[PDB]
Amino acid sequence: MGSMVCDVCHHECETAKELESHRQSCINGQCPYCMTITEATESALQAHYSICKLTGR
Ligand SMILES: [Zn+2]
Ligand SMILES: [Zn+2]
């Protein structure tokens, strides 16, 4: 855990401000910007964020 890490997927975000929107989409299994949906688990969300950077772009 850290000041730049999500409360659900335990992955990073482009900014500490978008990080608050990141967790609110992760709890529902969704990406905060490309709107893609998967399982609401860290294993599935990490697999998505490993290929997605629209999260703060
Ligand atoms: Zn997240
Ligand atoms: Zn995405």
Side-chain angles (χ1 to χ4, degrees):
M1 190 51 184
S3 57
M4 208 71 172
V5 183
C6 182
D7 289 283
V8 179
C9 68
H10 233 70
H11 194 274
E12 59 168 66
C13 190
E14 295 291 83
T15 86
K17 180 76 288 302
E18 274 58 83
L19 196 68
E20 181 174 52
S21 294
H22 202 284
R23 68 185 180 190
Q24 292 290 86
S25 304
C26 289
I27 196 63
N28 292 293
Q30 186 164 43
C31 177
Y33 278 88
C34 82
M35 303 300 171
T36 296
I37 305 181
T38 191
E39 299 186 88
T41 65
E42 78 172 271
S43 306
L45 290 168
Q46 285 161 22
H48 181 66
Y49 299 128
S50 294
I51 69 171
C52 194
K53 274 290 185 181
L54 286 164
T55 58
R57 293 186 186 205

